[PDB]
Ligand binder design. Structure first.
Ligand SMILES: CCC(C)(C)C(=O)C(=O)N1CCCC[C@H]1C(=O)O[C@H](CCc1ccccc1)c1ccccc1
Length: 107
């Protein structure tokens, strides 16, 4: 599954809905702390639409639990991420992923 652990609270009332665009900042890490990517290093938020099937399943499920303004750590099991394939060259097979995600805005 995905485990959502809060870093900073959101407004507690504006949660993303299917068809909305979530504007997030993120840093993705492996369980040992190794960063594999971060939009914070590019200083440009990442956008995805909820329910469109264009991000990994632990994101659709985890970010839907977040209210605008919230910063949380999402621990995502491999079956909710890249499974046995992994992402060629970046994520190994069977990897648990840890994302530090801040939900900035809904568009
Ligand atoms: C940018 C890619 C990477 C590995 C550096 C990364 O940090 C990542 O895992 N991310 C990107 C930010 C959203 C979460 C996740 C993802 O859904 O990627 C999608 C994965 C596509 C997909 C979805 C489901 C099952 C398999 C593959 C992604 C988005 C954009 C570009 C490439 C991958």
């Amino acid at each position: 599954g995905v485990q959502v652990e809060t870093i900073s609270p959101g407004d507690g009332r504006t949660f993303p809905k299917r068809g909305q665009t979530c504007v997030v900042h993120y840093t993705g890490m492996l369980e040992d702390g190794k960063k594999f990517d971060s939009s914070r290093d590019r200083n440009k938020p990442f956008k995805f639409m909820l329910g469109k099937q264009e991000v990994i399943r632990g994101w659709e499920e985890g970010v839907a639990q977040m209210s605008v303004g919230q910063r949380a750590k999402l621990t995502i099991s491999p079956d909710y991420a890249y499974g046995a394939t992994g992402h060629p060259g970046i994520i190994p097979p069977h990897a648990t992923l840890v994302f530090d995600v801040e939900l900035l805005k809904l568009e």
